[PDB]
Swiss-Prot record, chain A:
Function: Non-receptor tyrosine-protein kinase that plays a role in many key processes linked to cell growth and survival such as cytoskeleton remodeling in response to extracellular stimuli, cell motility and adhesion, receptor endocytosis, autophagy, DNA damage response and apoptosis. Coordinates actin remodeling through tyrosine phosphorylation of proteins controlling cytoskeleton dynamics like WASF3 (involved in branch formation); ANXA1 (involved in membrane anchoring); DBN1, DBNL, CTTN, RAPH1 and ENAH (involved in signaling); or MAPT and PXN (microtubule-binding proteins).
Protein name per the record: Tyrosine-protein kinase ABL1
Record disease entry: Leukemia, chronic myeloid: A clonal myeloproliferative disorder of a pluripotent stem cell with a specific cytogenetic abnormality, the Philadelphia chromosome (Ph), involving myeloid, erythroid, megakaryocytic, B-lymphoid, and sometimes T-lymphoid cells, but not marrow fibroblasts.
Signal peptide stretch: none
Tissues/organs with expression: Widely expressed.
Post-translational note: Polyubiquitinated. Polyubiquitination of ABL1 leads to degradation.
Assigned protein family: Belongs to the protein kinase superfamily. Tyr protein kinase family. ABL subfamily.
């Protein structure tokens, strides 16, 4: 839910980039796609750039950004990629303010 | 107090660095500065011992202050800061810090 500090609901790529504009390395948010409803993305700041990653759902319903690492819930995915980058440009560190 | 010896109010580890009639800015710069790898803070505030709604918001772990706005002037609020060093589902930290204050 939008109860989580890292979850920002429907936010466009462009709006996500401006949200991270005053963040630092590891600043991130999870959002819903405005153009593909039902789809979720992670936007992550690293070295003066913003990296956008689609969150995939496998047929068993597990969530992942890296095929090797699949989780039951978005919160487990975030916790995991906060611990180890594991295919991301860097670890998820600071959720954009809410 | 007891027993011939002293009693003090519990002190706060929070500082109020800015105040207007409807808002307060709090700083934890001198406490979660020591406790580290903070990912984010959750700040909660409501009228002290009120029936009132308890409001909450979150800011990134590298922030040292947050503004609390939309307050009633001259009414006591209890403001509590929770530091989260992990996103593990269902984790809650051991020792939040708080302050009672009014504008």
């Amino acid at each position: 839910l939008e109860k989580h500090s890292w979850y920002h609901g429907p936010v466009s790529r462009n709006a996500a980039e401006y949200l991270l504009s005053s963040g630092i390395n590891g600043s991130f948010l999870v959002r819903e796609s405005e153009s593909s409803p039902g789809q979720r993305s992670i936007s992550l700041r690293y070295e003066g750039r913003v990296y956008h990653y689609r969150i995939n759902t496998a047929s068993d319903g597990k969530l992942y950004v890296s095929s090797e690492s699949r989780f039951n819930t978005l919160a487990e995915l975030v916790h995991h990629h906060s611990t180890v980058a594991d295919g991301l440009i860097t670890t998820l560190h600071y959720p954009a303010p809410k | 107090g007891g027993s011939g010896s002293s009693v003090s109010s519990v002190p706060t580890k929070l500082e109020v660095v800015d105040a207007t009639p409807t808002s307060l800015k709090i700083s934890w710069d001198a406490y979660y500065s020591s406790w580290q790898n903070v990912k984010y803070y959750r700040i909660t505030y409501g009228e002290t011992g009120g029936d009132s709604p308890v409001q909450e918001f979150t800011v990134p772990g590298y922030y040292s202050t947050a503004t609390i706005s939309g307050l009633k002037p001259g009414v006591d609020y209890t403001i509590t800061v929770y530091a989260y060093d992990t996103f593990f589902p269902g984790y809650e930290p051991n020792s939040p810090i708080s302050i009672n204050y009014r504008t």
